[PDB]
Every structure is written in structure tokens, then in C-alpha cells.
Design a protein around this ligand. Structure first.
Ligand SMILES: CCCCCCCC/C=C\CCCCCCCC(=O)O[C@@H](COC(=O)CCCCCCCCCCCCCCC)COP(=O)([O-])OCC[N+](C)(C)C
Ligand SMILES: CCCCCCCC/C=C\CCCCCCCC(=O)O[C@@H](COC(=O)CCCCCCCCCCCCCCC)COP(=O)([O-])OCC[N+](C)(C)C
Ligand SMILES: CCCCCCCC/C=C\CCCCCCCC(=O)O[C@@H](COC(=O)CCCCCCCCCCCCCCC)COP(=O)([O-])OCC[N+](C)(C)C
Ligand SMILES: CCCCCCCC/C=C\CCCCCCCC(=O)O[C@@H](COC(=O)CCCCCCCCCCCCCCC)COP(=O)([O-])OCC[N+](C)(C)C
Ligand SMILES: CCCCCCCCCCCCCC
Ligand SMILES: CCCCCCCCCCCCCC
Ligand SMILES: CCCCCCCCCCCCCC
Ligand SMILES: CCCCCCCCCCCCCC
Ligand SMILES: CCCCCCCCCCCCCC
Ligand SMILES: CCCCCCCCCCCCCC
Ligand SMILES: CCCCCCCCCCC
Ligand SMILES: CCCCCCCCCCC
Ligand SMILES: CCCCCCCCCCC
Ligand SMILES: CCCCCCCCCCC
Ligand SMILES: CCCCCCCCCCC
Ligand SMILES: CCCCCCCCCCC
Ligand SMILES: CCCCCCCCCCC
Ligand SMILES: CCCCCCCCCCC
Ligand SMILES: CCCCCCCCCCC
Ligand SMILES: CCCCCCCCCCC
Ligand code: NA
Ligand code: NA
Lengths: 443, 443
């Protein structure tokens, strides 16, 4: 009987072709070249293959390049080459929905990992580094945007806020592995960097929106700023009652306990994220999800372990989709070759600023010198939020049909997209590599 | 903490509402009253609730009424009441696809249950009772249709063939439970009634089609009859090479063996059924599926057990859909109150004929008197095939815009639909009840 490497390769080859064939027969022409479902399948497979090649087969001689770069490049190539783009076209409604489900899963993993005791003695620090680096980065980037790019102050600040928000899709997967090995759980570094990801997106989007309106002179600053406060209050209130809801009603006397639990947390997480966007309170589905998952984890003292394993498997299926799609938005017709060298300057200097301010924010928390550096370098990655709100400024500029504001809009897109390419791949490397050396592994 | 019956009821109530809510938020207005996805969800839940009430809560005092009747009635009520019909509307493409997947799953379970040694010494019997009762039932029903209904000979024979084919969705689930208890595996009755379901549908559809064309004087009888022979040859040829394909390449040295195997058999089964319908050879996806699953089971000597458990769970999810949808095709505007009493006569007498001829076909197989009666009464149920091809004659009659042929078409629909209501519910009862008493349970 055939066996060994010959057996394994032919088993996967059929599955790839079968998974297309099975979907094709049921759905028909949607799963053929130029169809919505065809775009999803091979973007899934191109991202998976792209991830394997870079990290394992092509270039492992340097410090192991993470699969984030491979998936991000696979979407980049699919989008830009015209011969392979016209045959691969996912609709925007399916694009946002799949990314939102990826966001829903990652927050559930983040919520089910936070240590209650560790979060207790780290509350001022979580607030500081969530809103401290982001505001200073917003100002410092806006200072540079007014001089290196020449954008006015209003367009400087939307550039700052779009460049400010950290991404929990790069940090949380990396720090959960460190928590699995207990590399820093003595003092709470892994829980520090997974809980702070909530409020920085509320500040960034609220900062982006209220500074976007004043650039177009529509709406009022009072509601846009007050919305950000309301996102917090309804996020906790909805999240709190849902947290005690799941913590009791699936009880230890049922049969399909694990199956019923994992459906409840992730199903309500998907409900929270999509409904909040629909009803007009974006970002209240990420604070709700993180709160309800955390509280649900405090009643699931030791029986939460089986839940997160199923969530971990789901993330492995959605990571190629999320990062592959993100690279699929960046074109080269929305970027300007006149300004790429000094659009690296604003991103390059702002990262230096972001590292510097993150040092001071954590400088009074009892951590030693080494953990401050690790937190300083692990707060950089910026992937999901820049993709979500990068093109909003340019898209709104074209809707109003102005002239000069599209020139400003493209530069925001370049900074929003260059930030993903040069920070997220290097952010993942620093978290994985510097982790074991700096943090104190538990005896 | 809340517990007991209060805890269990509220856990399910949320899941029903959550499963609608989660789908609604992602999809939008499709999952609202008057939407395709809304029709599916509550048809799923109405069929499930309808099944529970009849068999357990409402009427268990009589011999336990099977859940087939409950699901069949739930679809019947949803279709006919106008206030609950306009709010529940599944599209035909989704209707056929979900029923075809249910057909694909049931044949996989049938294929993975056949005993190779038992099928060896029962081959003439399998051929006889597959084509013996069906042909005599086709003739006897056509004899009655020409007198009791008054239909001419051409419309008599399409009435015979639409009324001939047995259904493997009622027999196979019932006989697999008997095989689980080993109620008749000494001589091979369970394998006898699961393997014969293949060729009777090839004969019925081929008999239906070639007699349908001559009723409308289109096409030629040579190809329509020759198609039925070709369905057998390509069904085995495609099924055989696929059977040895799966039997080797997932080998005992892999990790996700069970997951990879169960995807292969059911994925290829779905591919076989849908592609054959698309390419124009219906029924070659049921013989292919039964053959490939059987051969795959002969290399999976003892490691096939874990596969069929996952298939069994999938069937429990698709049984409400299949039987609920079947009852959702039967209206009361396509039935004629002038002729229901004597349309029971043709169905009533034909069942008596079908039982009588099934006795003789099995009368020389070494079985004793008791097992012949059990096989005689377990060959009756007729649900899936009548639903699939019942309305084809009337639908084609309206397309040609004739006058008299719609009168003949409605009567075929009444017989095709009355056959499901009075044979399948009573067929399931006889298989379950008479089973333990007549068959010889293994010591
Ligand atoms: C919760 C209670 C329910 C219980 C669960 C049941 C839930 C369902 C679960 C399993 C059943 C699978 C669904 C079968 C029926 C849908 C398919 C279909 O008919 O699409 C139709 C429309 O489709 C569309 O136009 C929209 C695209 C989404 C289709 C469904 C997505 C999944 C398709 C893959 C399924 C995954 C495969 C399995 C996993 C690998 C196709 O029609 P068409 O596009 O017009 O083609 C004609 C093209 N032409 C016009 C150009 C000629
Ligand atoms: C936006 C998305 C919303 C959410 C999406 C859903 C995501 C999550 C959904 C599902 C993922 C969770 C289930 C994973 C598989 C089971 C793994 C498992 O842990 O078993 C668990 C239960 O399971 C069983 O006991 C086996 C029987 C399962 C049948 C229930 C059907 C579920 C699949 C239907 C799928 C529909 C398919 C058709 C759809 C077209 C636990 O059993 P155990 O491990 O043996 O331990 C015993 C537990 N005990 C000790 C407490 C007693
Ligand atoms: C294989 C490799 C890929 C990896 C796996 C990924 C595969 C996917 C797996 C999980 C992701 C779930 C899919 C998310 C994106 C699709 C939803 C969507 O946007 O539909 C859109 C279209 O949809 C349609 O019009 C056709 C209907 C089928 C939609 C998909 C079926 C499943 C929807 C439930 C999903 C199951 C929930 C979870 C289980 C409980 C909705 O747009 P709309 O209808 O126009 O709304 C506007 C209405 N209006 C115009 C009137 C205003
Ligand atoms: C038309 C339809 C086409 C077909 C449809 C597919 C139907 C079937 C598909 C899936 C059903 C089969 C899987 C059921 C769940 C596992 C149960 C199981 O038996 O585990 C098995 C493997 O599984 C594992 O080892 C656990 C890890 C699974 C990850 C693989 C992802 C599969 C889910 C992705 C779903 C996509 C979700 C997102 C989609 C939007 C066996 O592990 P074990 O029991 O521990 O025994 C050890 C085995 N051993 C001894 C040989 C070593
Ligand atoms: C086991 C692998 C099976 C592959 C089947 C491929 C069938 C593809 C047919 C495409 C024809 C397109 C018709 C519109
Ligand atoms: C949002 C999409 C949900 C997909 C969940 C898939 C679950 C797969 C894990 C099942 C494996 C159970 C044994 C570990
Ligand atoms: C999405 C359709 C089901 C896919 C199941 C198998 C998942 C394949 C990707 C998982 C990651 C593999 C490399 C770690
Ligand atoms: C846990 C149960 C949550 C139920 C949420 C129900 C939300 C339904 C809102 C429907 C509004 C329709 C807007 C078009
Ligand atoms: C055609 C639709 C396929 C749906 C398959 C669902 C599989 C559910 C069974 C998983 C349970 C695994 C442990 C018994
Ligand atoms: C179809 C969406 C997933 C459903 C999972 C739970 C299955 C519910 C029906 C199973 C039968 C329950 C009564 C035996
Ligand atoms: C450890 C051997 C695993 C073999 C998988 C690599 C081959 C996959 C081919 C996918 C096209
Ligand atoms: C993901 C593998 C896809 C294999 C088929 C490619 C599309 C073929 C369409 C018909 C030429
Ligand atoms: C000086 C012109 C106005 C520039 C916009 C300032 C926005 C500051 C942040 C608002 C939250
Ligand atoms: C009776 C089992 C209840 C738990 C599973 C229900 C939801 C399944 C996931 C739906 C996608
Ligand atoms: C000021 C009240 C807002 C109405 C509620 C709509 C938003 C729902 C948020 C769900 C997380
Ligand atoms: C053995 C107790 C199980 C409770 C389930 C029955 C209540 C379900 C309510 C569904 C609406
Ligand atoms: C299967 C339970 C469905 C609960 C909601 C019914 C539809 C409500 C639509 C908005 C009135
Ligand atoms: C005597 C008129 C022709 C009636 C049709 C006979 C069909 C017999 C079965 C064909 C396979
Ligand atoms: C690497 C796991 C391969 C087995 C599972 C692939 C198919 C999953 C089912 C797709 C619906
Ligand atoms: C006479 C040759 C028919 C062409 C093959 C198309 C049918 C494929 C059947 C798949 C089971
Ligand atoms: Na964040
Ligand atoms: Na049959």
C-alpha cells in the first residue's frame, strides 16, 4: 500500500480539489472563475500556501519569519496582478463579515485568558498604556504630518488616530503562547497586553470620527465624542448582564455542556459585534465581547479549558482569511510614488515615539527593566484597525467630489497601509523572539 | 444556582433565538419574515417540535407514533395555512439541495452497514425484490388507473412507476437500529433491505421517463431506456474506482484520519449526486454512493465505526429538514376532492399487491415464514421518490399548455402524495414493532 510522503501529498491535493468541487456542484457558477465563492476558496489556499513557504520552506535561515507576512503578501499579489485579480473577486459584504468573525474569535480567546487576580493589581497600568501611547502617537504623528507631508491640522489628526490603534489580532495570538508556557504570568505581562486592547480602539475610532467630521464640516463634535463614552457604558452594561447570563444557565448537570457553551460565547460575540455595527455603535462589540468572555471565564474555573481549544481550532481556520483579506485591500493605484520615502518617515518616527512613550507609561508598575522593553516592543503591531478605517477618509472625500481632499486622502491611505507592512511583521517577530529571553519563565 | 427542569428549558430557548439572531445579523433581511433563510430555520424548528409532540407528549398511548409523521405534518401545515405560508418561503434551489444532501448521507450510512459475506449469499434475492415488486406494482396500479381513475394506458404507467419506488430514507434508518441490536444479522435480513434500494429507483425513474415521453410524444424510447442501463455502468465504474481510491490513500499512519475519511466519503457522495443530476444521469449518484461507501467499508475493517457515528449525527440534523420539506410540497390546490376516495383505492389495493408479490420474491431464499412477513411489510414505505418526481408530469403538462393532460396530471399528484401519507407512517411502525418479534435476535 502507498505510504510515506507520497501518501500524504496526494491526500491533501484531493481535499483542495474536492472542497472546490463539492461547493461548485451545490452552488454552480458562483464557485467558478469570476465568482464570489471562488475568490474565498483560493484566497484561503493561497494564504495558507503563502504562509507555509515563507516561514518554513523559503526563508528560515533568518529568525523564523512569521506566517503573518506570508498571508499578507499572498493577498497583496492576488489584488494587484490583473490577470489573477479579474478571476478573484470577493464582495465587500462577505469581506467585512469574515473579518468581523475573525475579530469576534480573537477577543473570545483574549477574554478567556485574562487572569482575574493579575488584572486586579494592574488596572491603572492597563488604562495608561491603552490611552497613553495612542494619544501621544496621535499628536506626534500629526506634528510630522503637518511638516513632512504638508497636510493641514484637521487631516493631520485623522492621520494620527488611524495610525494610533494597536491590533489585537497580532498581539493576542502571540501572548497566548507565552501564557501557555508561563513565560511571564508571575507578574501579569500577558494579561496586561491582552486587556488593554479594548479601550484604544474606542479612543481611536472616536478620535478618527470627530476629527473626520471637522475636516468635512458635518455633524457636531458633541455627539461624536459623547458616542465614545456611550460605547463604554453600553458595552459594559450589555456585556455584564450577558456575562452572568452564560456563567449560570449551562450548568454542570447537562450533557452537551462544552458544545452548548462554546456556541453561546462565540455566538453572542458575533451577535454583539454585528448588531453594534448595524445599530450605529461600532467598538461596543469588542468591549462587550471581552467583558462577557472574561466574566464567563470566572465561573468556568477549570472547565473553560475545553472551550478555548475549540476556539483555538477556529482561529487557525480564520487567520488565513483575516490576514489574507487585509492584504487584499491594498492596491498600488491608491498609493503615490511621489511620497513613499517620507511616508516611511512619519511611520518610522512615530514608532520610535510609540516605543518611547510606552516605556514611561509602564515605568512605575513594579516591572524590572527587561519587561518594560518587552512591553515597549510588543505594543507596536497595527494591522486590523488601519485596514478597517484607512479608506474611510478617501471614500468620503470622493463622495463629496472635492479636489484637494483626495490628495490628502491618498496619503492617509499610504500611511495606513505602510504601517501594516512594516510594523506587524516585525512586531510578531519581537514578541516571539524577545519573549523567552526577557520574561521570567515560571519555575 | 438555577438548575433542574428550569435550567434546561431556558438553555434551549436562548439557543433557538440565538441561532436566528446570529444568522440575522450577518445576513440581514434574508433571515426575516418573507426570507429564504427564515423559511429554513423555523421549518427546522417546527419539524423538530412537531416530531417531539406526536411521538412523546401528545399521543404515546397507541403504539409509539414515529417522528416521521410529526415532521411530515409540520411541513403540511406550514405550506397550506396562508397566514403562515407567505412568511415562510424557501426557494426551490435550496429545497432540492438540502434534500439531495439528506439523500447523500442516508446512502453513506446504508453503504457502511452492508455485510460483505451476507451480500455474497444474497444476490439473486436482492435483484428479485428490487425489480420484482416494482414491476408488478407498476402493472397492477396501471390496471386500476385505467378503470378506477379512467386515465389512459400511457398515463396509467407513469402513475405506476411514480407509485412503485420504495424509499431508502424510511427503511435504512429503521433497519440500522435492528442491525445495532443484531436482531436479524444471522441470515442477513438487514443487509437485504438496504442493498436493494439502489436498482428500484433506476428502474422507476427510467420507467417514469420513457413512459412520460410517450405520453407527450417527444424524444425516443431507445435512449430513455438505454439511459437506465448507462446509469448502472457508469455508476459502478465511477463508484468502483472511487471505492479503491478512498480505501488506501488515507492510511493508518496519519493524524486526522477520522476527520479526513468522513469528509472524503460524504464529500464525494455529495459530488456524485449533484454532478450526475447536472450532467444528465440522475440516479447514478445513488448507485455510485452505495458502491463506493461499501467498498470503502471493506478496507475499513473495524475503523469504520467512528466514521458512521459522525454520519449518524449528521442524519439527526437533516432528518427534520428532509421530511419537513417533503410535506411542504403537498398543497390542497393540486388535489381534487372529486377523487380522493378511489385514489385511496389504487394506493390501497397496490399496497396489497406489493405485499403479496414481495412474499413470492423472497419465498425461495431459505428464510422461514416469519422473516418473509417482515420483509413483506418492510418494503412498503414510499416518501422521497414520490416527492421528487410526483409533480414532473403536471409541471410538464402545463408547459405544453394542453387541456386534458392537466386533469391526468393532478390525479398522479394525488396518488403520489397520498402514497406518502398512508404508507410511510405505517411502514415505519411495522419495521420497528414487528422487528423484535419476528426476527431472530442474536444470542
Ligand atoms: C440552521 C438550520 C438549517 C440546517 C443546516 C442547513 C444550512 C446549510 C448547510 C448546508 C447545505 C449547503 C447549502 C445548500 C443550498 C445552498 C446552495 C445553493 O443552492 O446556492 C444557490 C444560490 O446561492 C447564492 O447565490 C448565494 C451564495 C451562498 C450559497 C450558500 C453558501 C454555501 C454554499 C456551499 C455550501 C457548503 C458546502 C458544504 C461545506 C463544504 C445556487 O444557485 P445559483 O448561484 O443561482 O447557481 C446558478 C448560477 N447561474 C445563475 C449563473 C446559472
Ligand atoms: C457565527 C458562528 C456561531 C457559532 C458557530 C458554532 C461554533 C461551535 C459549534 C460547534 C463546535 C463545538 C462542537 C465541536 C465538536 C464536538 C467536540 C466536543 O467537544 O464535544 C462536546 C459535545 O459534543 C458531543 O458530545 C458529541 C456530539 C455532538 C453533537 C452535537 C452537534 C454539534 C455539531 C452541529 C454543527 C452543525 C453542523 C451542520 C451545520 C450546517 C463535548 O463532548 P466531550 O468532549 O466528549 O466531553 C464530554 C462533556 N462533558 C464532560 C461535560 C459531559
Ligand atoms: C472554505 C473557505 C472559507 C472558510 C469558511 C468561510 C465560509 C463561511 C462560513 C462562515 C461565515 C458566514 C458567512 C459570512 C458572509 C456571508 C453572509 C452575507 O454577507 O450574506 C449576504 C448575502 O447573502 C445572500 O444573499 C445569500 C444567502 C447566503 C448567505 C450565506 C449563508 C450563510 C449565512 C449565515 C452564516 C451562518 C452563521 C454561522 C452558523 C450559525 C448578506 O447581504 P444581503 O442579503 O444583501 O443583506 C441586505 C438585505 N437587503 C438588501 C434587503 C437590505
Ligand atoms: C457537503 C458537505 C461536505 C462534507 C462536510 C464535512 C463533514 C465532515 C467534516 C467534519 C466532521 C468530522 C470532524 C468532527 C469533529 C471531530 C470529531 C473527531 O472524530 O475527531 C477526529 C479528528 O478531529 C480532531 O482530531 C480534532 C481536531 C479537528 C480539527 C480539524 C478541523 C475540522 C473541523 C473543520 C470544520 C470547518 C468549520 C468551518 C466551516 C465554515 C478524530 O480524532 P479522535 O476522535 O480524537 O481520534 C483520533 C484518531 N486517530 C486515532 C486516528 C488518531
Ligand atoms: C476527486 C476530484 C473530482 C474533481 C471533479 C472535477 C469536476 C469539474 C468539472 C468542471 C466542469 C465545469 C462545468 C461548467
Ligand atoms: C465561526 C465558525 C465556527 C467554526 C467552528 C469550527 C469548530 C472546529 C473545531 C471542532 C473540533 C472539536 C474537537 C477538538
Ligand atoms: C474552511 C474549510 C474547512 C477547512 C478545515 C481544515 C482547515 C485548514 C486550515 C487549517 C490550518 C492548517 C495549517 C495550520
Ligand atoms: C440572547 C437573545 C438576543 C436576541 C436579540 C434580538 C434582536 C432582534 C432585533 C430585530 C430588529 C429588526 C431590525 C430590522
Ligand atoms: C453535510 C453537512 C455536514 C455536517 C456535519 C456535522 C458534523 C457533526 C458531528 C460532529 C461531532 C463529532 C463528535 C461525535
Ligand atoms: C442546524 C444547526 C445546528 C443544530 C445543532 C443541534 C441539532 C438540533 C437537532 C438535532 C436533533 C435533536 C433531537 C434528536
Ligand atoms: C509531514 C508531511 C505532510 C505533507 C504535507 C505537505 C504536502 C501538502 C501539499 C499541498 C499542496
Ligand atoms: C482550489 C483548486 C481549484 C481547482 C479548480 C480550478 C478552477 C477550475 C474551473 C474550471 C476550469
Ligand atoms: C486647530 C484645528 C482643529 C484641529 C482638530 C483638533 C482635534 C483634536 C482631537 C479632537 C478629539
Ligand atoms: C443540542 C445541541 C445544542 C448545541 C449545538 C447547537 C448549535 C450548533 C452550532 C450551530 C452552528
Ligand atoms: C442610546 C441607546 C442605543 C440603542 C441601542 C442600540 C445599540 C445596541 C448595542 C448592542 C451591543
Ligand atoms: C430532559 C429535559 C430536557 C428539557 C428539554 C425540553 C424543553 C425544550 C424547550 C424547547 C422550546
Ligand atoms: C426561531 C425563533 C425566531 C424568533 C424571532 C422571530 C422573527 C422576529 C422578526 C422580527 C419581528
Ligand atoms: C399501449 C400504449 C403504450 C403504453 C406505454 C407502455 C409502457 C410500458 C413500459 C415501458 C418501459
Ligand atoms: C487538515 C484537516 C483536513 C480534514 C478536514 C478538511 C475538510 C473539513 C470539512 C470542510 C467542510
Ligand atoms: C456517456 C458519457 C456520459 C458523460 C459523463 C457525464 C456523467 C458523469 C456522471 C458522474 C457520476
Ligand atoms: Na486594540
Ligand atoms: Na430505493
Amino acid at each position: 500500500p502507498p505510504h510515506g510522503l507520497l501518501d500524504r501529498v496526494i491526500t491533501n491535493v484531493t481535499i483542495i480539489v474536492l472542497l472546490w468541487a463539492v461547493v461548485w456542484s451545490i452552488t454552480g457558477s458562483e464557485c467558478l472563475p469570476g465568482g464570489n465563492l471562488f475568490g474565498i476558496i483560493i484566497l484561503f489556499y493561497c494564504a495558507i500556501i503563502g504562509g507555509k513557504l515563507l516561514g518554513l520552506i523559503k526563508l528560515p535561515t533568518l529568525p523564523p519569519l512569521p506566517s503573518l507576512l506570508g498571508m499578507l503578501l499572498a493577498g497583496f499579489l492576488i489584488r494587484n496582478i490583473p490577470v489573477i485579480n479579474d478571476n478573484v473577486q470577493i464582495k465587500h459584504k462577505w469581506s467585512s463579515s469574515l473579518r468581523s468573525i475573525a475579530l469576534s474569535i480573537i477577543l473570545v480567546r483574549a477574554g478567556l485568558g485574562l487572569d482575574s487576580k493579575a488584572l486586579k493589581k494592574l488596572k491603572g497600568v492597563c488604562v495608561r498604556l491603552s490611552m497613553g501611547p495612542c494619544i501621544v502617537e496621535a499628536c506626534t504623528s500629526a506634528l510630522l504630518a503637518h511638516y513632512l507631508l504638508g497636510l493641514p491640522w484637521q487631516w493631520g489628526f485623522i492621520l494620527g488616530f488611524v495610525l494610533g490603534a494597536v491590533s489585537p489580532a497580532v498581539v493576542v495570538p502571540s501572548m497566548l503562547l507565552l501564557q501557555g508556557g508561563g513565560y511571564g504570568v508571575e507578574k501579569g505581562v500577558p494579561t496586561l497586553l491582552m486587556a488593554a486592547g479594548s479601550f484604544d480602539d474606542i479612543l481611536a475610532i472616536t478620535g478618527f470620527n470627530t476629527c473626520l467630521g471637522i475636516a468635512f464640516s458635518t455633524g457636531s463634535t458633541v455627539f461624536n465624542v459623547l458616542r465614545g463614552v456611550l460605547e463604554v457604558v453600553i458595552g459594559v452594561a450589555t456585556g455584564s448582564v450577558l456575562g452572568f447570563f452564560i456563567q449560570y444557565f449551562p450548568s454542570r448537570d447537562q450533557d452537551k455542556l462544552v458544545c452548548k457553551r462554546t456556541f453561546l460565547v462565540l455566538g453572542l460575540s458575533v451577535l454583539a459585534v454585528f448588531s453594534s455595527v448595524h445599530f450605529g455603535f461600532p467598538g461596543s462589540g469588542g468591549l462587550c465581547t471581552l467583558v462577557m468572555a472574561f466574566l464567563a471565564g470566572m465561573g468556568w474555573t477549570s472547565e473553560k479549558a475545553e472551550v478555548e481549544k475549540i476556539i483555538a481550532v477556529a482561529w487557525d481556520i480564520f487567520q488565513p482569511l483575516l490576514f489574507g483579506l487585509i492584504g487584499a485591500e491594498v492596491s498600488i493605484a491608491s498609493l503615490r510614488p511621489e511620497t513613499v520615502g517620507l511616508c516611511v518617515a512619519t511611520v518610522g518616527i512615530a514608532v520610535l515615539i510609540r516605543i518611547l512613550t510606552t516605556f514611561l507609561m509602564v515605568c512605575f508598575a513594579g516591572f524590572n527593566l527587561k519587561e518594560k522593553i518587552f512591553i515597549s516592543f510588543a505594543w507596536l503591531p497595527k494591522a486590523t484597525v488601519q485596514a478597517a478605517i484607512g479608506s474611510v477618509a478617501l471614500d468620503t472625500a470622493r463622495s463629496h467630489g472635492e479636489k484637494q481632499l483626495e490628495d490628502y486622502g491618498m496619503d492617509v491611505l499610504t500611511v495606513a497601509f505602510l504601517s501594516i507592512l512594516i510594523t506587524a511583521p516585525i512586531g510578531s517577530l519581537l514578541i516571539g523572539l524577545l519573549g523567552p529571553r526577557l520574561l521570567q519563565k515560571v519555575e
